[PDB]
């Protein structure tokens, strides 16, 4: 399971 | 110009369902990621739920865990929230929320804001 | 990660440098934005990375801070600038987490 807070973007 | 409109809210009778919705313009829906964060006054705000640009990743606070179920249309550019049993505690002004585009492995800020939505939950 | 801000509420008046203190109970890097919220609207954003400033923000709002302690500052407050700001983390698997907020109220 990695990082939630990782870039949501495209 | 970039803009969000929540709709959907109401009185809702405690432990039913109820569906809140975000409508997005101006801005590349698709591109973004999104959130939903409510707020009352008595407690200030509290994030709910993220949805990733692509819909592949969903993360829920743990207060919301297993009842909310966040989703979105990057054809219509809506931002929807299922929210079901829904308790007292759920009565809370229901953002929809963008973040902000940065480049890298990281994620950003809250650089955009929905008018807010109101839920009632009571019986 | 909880984000304590203290004082709760504050009073100022027109001119006054505001210094508004932010306090992560764990460490979150620079990863920290700063919000102001007129009662009734929708929060906007001031502040993101706890030091870089938001397109259309004005030049009096300005941040710095890293690790557990962050501070807003404002070098002269504004009639339009009486609100509740608020401070969160983004750092980590910590997910997202904001404070109570500082009231900046107008004396008397």
């Known amino acids: 399971n990695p990082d939630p807070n990782a870039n949501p973007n495209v | 110009q970039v803009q969000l409109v929540e709709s959907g809210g109401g009185v809702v009778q405690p432990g039913r369902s109820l569906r809140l919705s975000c409508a997005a313009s101006?801005?590349?829906?698709?591109?973004?990621?999104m959130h939903w964060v409510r707020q009352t006054p008595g407690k200030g705000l509290e994030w709910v739920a993220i949805?990733?640009?692509?819909?592949?990743?969903?993360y829920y606070a743990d207060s919301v865990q297993g009842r909310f179920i966040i989703s979105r249309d990057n054809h219509k550019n809506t931002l929807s929230l299922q929210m079901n049993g829904l308790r007292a505690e759920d009565t809370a002004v229901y953002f929809c929320?963008?973040?902000?585009?940065?480049?890298?492995?990281?994620?950003?800020?809250?650089?955009?804001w929905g008018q807010g939505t109101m839920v009632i939950v009571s019986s | 990660v909880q984000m304590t801000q203290s004082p709760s509420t504050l009073s100022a008046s027109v001119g006054d440098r505001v210094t508004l203190t932010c306090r992560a109970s764990?460490?979150?890097?620079?990863?920290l934005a700063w919000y102001q919220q007129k009662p009734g609207k929708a929060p906007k954003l001031l502040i993101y990375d706890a030091s870089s400033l938001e397109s259309g923000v004005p030049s009096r709002f300005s941040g710095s801070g890293s690790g557990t302690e962050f501070t807003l500052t404002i070098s002269s407050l504004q009639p339009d600038d009486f609100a509740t700001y608020y401070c969160?983390?983004?750092?980590?698997?910590?997910?997202?987490?904001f404070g109570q907020g500082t009231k900046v109220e107008i004396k008397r």
């Open positions: 764990q460490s979150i890097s620079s990863w």
């Open positions: 929320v963008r973040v902000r585009f940065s480049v890298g492995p990281h994620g950003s800020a809250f650089d955009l």
């Open positions: 101006g801005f590349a829906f698709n591109t973004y990621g």
């Open positions: 949805i990733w640009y692509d819909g592949s990743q969903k």
């Open positions: 969160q983390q983004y750092n980590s698997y910590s997910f997202w987490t």
